[PDB]
Amino acid sequence: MLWHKLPKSIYFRRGSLPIALDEVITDGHKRALIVTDRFLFNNGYADQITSVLKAAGVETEVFFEVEADPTLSIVRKGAELANSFKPDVIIALGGGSPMDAAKIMWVMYEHPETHFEELALRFMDIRKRIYKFPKMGVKAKMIAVTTTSGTGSEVTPFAVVTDDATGQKYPLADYALTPDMAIVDANLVMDMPKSLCAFGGLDAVTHAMEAYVSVLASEFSDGQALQALKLLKEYLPASYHEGSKNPVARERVHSAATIAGIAFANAFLGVCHSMAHKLGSQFHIPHGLANALLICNVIRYNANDNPTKQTAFSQYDRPQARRRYAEIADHLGLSAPGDRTAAKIEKLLAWLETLKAELGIPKSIREAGVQEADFLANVDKLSEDAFDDQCTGANPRYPLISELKQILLDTYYGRDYVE
Amino acid sequence: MLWHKLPKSIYFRRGSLPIALDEVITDGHKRALIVTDRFLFNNGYADQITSVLKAAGVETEVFFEVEADPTLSIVRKGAELANSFKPDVIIALGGGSPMDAAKIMWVMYEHPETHFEELALRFMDIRKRIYKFPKMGVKAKMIAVTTTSGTGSEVTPFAVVTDDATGQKYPLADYALTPDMAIVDANLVMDMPKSLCAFGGLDAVTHAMEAYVSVLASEFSDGQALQALKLLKEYLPASYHEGSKNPVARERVHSAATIAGIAFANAFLGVCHSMAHKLGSQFHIPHGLANALLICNVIRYNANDNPTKQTAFSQYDRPQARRRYAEIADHLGLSAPGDRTAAKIEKLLAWLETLKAELGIPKSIREAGVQEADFLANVDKLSEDAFDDQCTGANPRYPLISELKQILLDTYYGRDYVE
Missing domain, CATH: 3.40.50.1970 (Rossmann fold)
Known part of the structure; x- marks a missing residue:
């Protein structure tokens, strides 16, 4: 219910x-x-x-x-x-x-x-x-x-x-x-x-991208998540570069960030906010910047029609995550007619890099001011303590501590999350 | 100087x-x-x-x-x-x-x-x-x-x-x-x-009565002390009974209390504020009420032309306290022509009782809510610690710890300070 x-x-x-x-x-x-x-x-x-x-x-x-x-x-x-x-x-x-x-x-x-x-x-x-x-x-x-x-x-x-x-x-x-x-x-x-309109307006992209796919997702919290995503695509870049010179965009983005709150308040977050919270309190990285480095992999993680586990929710019968991430692109225009449900995600992730490159967002955590020695030494800590966060009790494939660390590291070395 | x-x-x-x-x-x-x-x-x-x-x-x-x-x-x-x-x-x-x-x-x-x-x-x-x-x-x-x-x-x-x-x-x-x-x-x-217009407007009577007599007293800080004393005599009773119904008195008294500050800021207090501070922090008695019970004896103390000691101040050659307390009365009208400098003080102390009776002020400390067992047990403490207060380094007869306690007790039992 x-x-x-x-x-x-x-x-x-x-x-x-x-x-x-x-x-x-x-x-x-x-x-x-x-x-x-x-x-x-x-x-x-x-x-x-x-x-x-x-x-x-x-x-x-x-x-x-x-x-x-x-x-x-x-x-x-x-x-x-x-x-x-x-x-x-x-x-x-x-x-x-x-x-x-x-x-x-x-x-x-x-x-x-x-x-x-x-x-x-x-x-x-x-x-x-x-x-x-x-x-x-x-x-x-x-x-x-x-x-x-x-x-x-x-x-x-x-x-x-x-x-x-x-x-x-x-x-x-x-x-x-x-x-x-x-x-x-x-x-x-x-x-x-700009350091805030980016991090902030880019967490919102996660507030809504791991809410349209969550298991508690419902028709109520799917059109809002999307509308929070069609506005963060047409007005977030402009609100960064033009700043106050395009107050409409700096306004629409402000509403979007809230609309995503209308979503993830009802359909809790996934796993990016679990690893983010622990990865941003240890290394004192901001919220939005921890979410922008991981989201482009968590997708590669949740988008596996045959994962190790589901989240065991009645309304969630079969894993649909690889699909939801396509309706997203299909709604934002990234998708061309005649796709195969495997490129719509590439075309989606491509839109993020394209969006993270034009906001001042690095390509990994190493570039974000964290020493390889201070990370690998305490990675297993925030990888066991992410699993123990309340946000991860809603993402569609119940991550393994085996599988979280792997995406922590692949975000440190800027790598992907093949499996 | x-x-x-x-x-x-x-x-x-x-x-x-x-x-x-x-x-x-x-x-x-x-x-x-x-x-x-x-x-x-x-x-x-x-x-x-x-x-x-x-x-x-x-x-x-x-x-x-x-x-x-x-x-x-x-x-x-x-x-x-x-x-x-x-x-x-x-x-x-x-x-x-x-x-x-x-x-x-x-x-x-x-x-x-x-x-x-x-x-x-x-x-x-x-x-x-x-x-x-x-x-x-x-x-x-x-x-x-x-x-x-x-x-x-x-x-x-x-x-x-x-x-x-x-x-x-x-x-x-x-x-x-x-x-x-x-x-x-x-x-x-x-x-x-009323509990404040009395205690407050009655400390001021001491701020000025142990400032016109202090050793640091000067022509500068003697007319103000008095003017703080001719107003607290004609307007303090009215400001208690009539209250706000005589705002002029409730105003003049407010200025007097300050004028006495123009005095005792320059001519420091005597000894009543030393024993008061220690007697009002132990038994949590208010300031003005500790000063109204003692002042009517400290006078009987400082008004002894042959005390044990003076305060050793160049400007203070001979003990003049028994005299100053007369110019006070001589200024307030308590004095009748043809006195002898010994009744002007009685006529002064008489004006206080008359003034303490008509403000709700008790006749001793016992009546002020302090148990004889809690007093005599710690009297020698606040009697040695009064001597160690900065205010007492200005009163005209450098009190002995032998002589302070005696007036603490005579204010507990409502007695006088004969010697």
């Missing part, structure tokens, strides 16, 4: 933010907290929402102390603040690291009794979950603005954090901590650098 | 606060921090200054986490914040606990190298000080609003804090941490409770 659940509000157009607070926050709340990173407190992005609340009978407080790949130390810090200001609403902002950290502070504020380890517990299903998350709408709601175009955390329950002790990103998940509102306005990403 | 140094600005009238920020802060600064207590963050007293700054090109941050009798834990907490927001100006508010804590955060922000123990070091003189405080006007200025009428911390270098480990208030002092501006508007004390 399946579902398609999101916030009961997703406002999205250039100029939507005040028209998403002049509307709902002030009509129901008078004590707000804001979560973001310093670059946005400094550059005047959080005073774009405190301007409109303080003008109303609302009292704001900003937790600008967040860092990339957030830790559990910060989260506990914002709760202390949240436990002191007693907010009626939380307004995450900045994209990813803040959003992934505010919806968990939302927890430690509603229920400070919680223990993070009981949240990072992998599971076989989301309903048959041992640590049923508590109900969180009673103390304060949770709003989610975003300033990047690669995460989808505005919609999805995923909340990636780090222990600060082991150094293991725990992509915990539960729909009980979806935002009540998601605001995705391109006013905030028009001036975003 | 002596001095009379204060901020280069003391604005004071009902409605002065915006006219003290619309004037100077915004003309020179664009990044401000505010320090206060929760009662004022909650009750809308800090958004009376953030309203006017944010309306300008200024970014504010409020450290509302302060508690009565502040600790060194909070102070180090606000520095972390101050080290993160990087303010151009600090705006203390609330009176006492915040003000005494912000001008020391000002230190840990300018010079985080400092070590509190090297600040709480008693000394024989302020110039001949071992730990010459550093220069602090370079990172951020320091403003000082006040919302109570008993402290004078707006003007004075005194910054009373607590280790949080030993529990010993260290009334450190240095003019290098005087505020650059002091704002004393009665708009903020009109709605102050």
Whole structure:
């Protein structure tokens, strides 16, 4: 059985933010907290929402102390603040690291009794979950603005954090901590650098490419994934080169990244986000860049009509991955009439290299600043710990630790994944 | 040698606060921090200054986490914040606990190298000080609003804090941490409770009664002390009973409390503030209430023309304390023509009881919630540790530990201090 659940509000157009607070926050709340990173407190992005609340009978407080790949130390810090200001609403902002950290502070504020380890517990299903998350709408709601175009955390329950002790990103998940509102306005990403419009807008390509093929994939989460893929193909290159000079593309890509969140929130990720999380917390590689190096092989991995194993899901009778990856190309135009289902993937992978070459993305991990000695020494660790991530419990061929490492290395040496 | 140094600005009238920020802060600064207590963050007293700054090109941050009798834990907490927001100006508010804590955060922000123990070091003189405080006007200025009428911390270098480990208030002092501006508007004390208008407006009676008699007393700091005493006599009772119904008195008293700060900042306190600090940190008695129980005896102590010792100050040739306490009464009207310098003190002490009875002040410490067993057991401690306070190095008869305890006890049993 399946579902398609999101916030009961997703406002999205250039100029939507005040028209998403002049509307709902002030009509129901008078004590707000804001979560973001310093670059946005400094550059005047959080005073774009405190301007409109303080003008109303609302009292704001900003937790600008967040860092990339957030830790559990910060989260506990914002709760202390949240436990002191007693907010009626939380307004995450900045994209990813803040959003992934505010919806968990939302927890430690509603229920400070919680223990993070009981949240990072992998599971076989989301309903048959041992640590049923508590109900969180009673103390304060949770709003989610975003300033990047690669995460989808505005919609999805995923909340990636780090222990600060082991150094293991725990992509915990539960729909009980979806935002009540998601605001995705391109006013905030028009001036975003290229190092981000690439990594971000290129994870989104995975958010949707290992969601249209996942086993939990459904008709609900297949047209959105695609529409997140026909826009990242016609507007992502332009948003990189032209930047703010083509705000429509820098806008459409911002919506796509979110639409892919409308997909992978319902149809969880595959395996690229498992190896990515572990490969980007060890070597401190960003999210999107770990996903762009692997995706072009994971496909070569999941696209084997006769794998070693399937993921054992009723709705998934026969392995269809080699097929789905073709409907993708068939939808994007990469496919020519009279193909054979084996080139449509080549024509697809060819579109990525062509797309990774024109965004500043390297051809391997070695080129990405990781020493062969620091990799091979700890590869078996992140290859056993990827298997133990919750994201991999949805990809269509239940990878073997024998088979993950092989694609870690073939992405280090820029090789393929023949079998 | 002596001095009379204060901020280069003391604005004071009902409605002065915006006219003290619309004037100077915004003309020179664009990044401000505010320090206060929760009662004022909650009750809308800090958004009376953030309203006017944010309306300008200024970014504010409020450290509302302060508690009565502040600790060194909070102070180090606000520095972390101050080290993160990087303010151009600090705006203390609330009176006492915040003000005494912000001008020391000002230190840990300018010079985080400092070590509190090297600040709480008693000394024989302020110039001949071992730990010459550093220069602090370079990172951020320091403003000082006040919302109570008993402290004078707006003007004075005194910054009373607590280790949080030993529990010993260290009334450190240095003019290098005087505020650059002091704002004393009665708009903020009109709605102050009676438990505070009494304790506060009754310490001020000591701020000035052991400053007109101190050895460092000078013509500069004698008319102010008195004017702080002719106003606390004609307007303090009315500000207690009538409260906000006589805002002129609730205003004049607010200025007096500050004028006494113009005195005891230059002519340090005597001994009542030494025993008070130690007697109010052990039994958690408030400041003003520890000073109102003792003052009516310390006078009987300092008013002995033949004491055991003087304070050894050149300007202080013969003990004049028994005389000064008469010019006080002679100025307030308590004195009738044809007295003998021995009744003018009785007529003075009589004015206090008469004044302590009509403010809700008890007649002893026992009545103030302190058990005879918890007092006599630790009296010799706060009697040896009062002698070691910096305030007592200015009172005119260099008390003996033999003689302090005797007045601690006579204030417990409500007795006098015959000798």
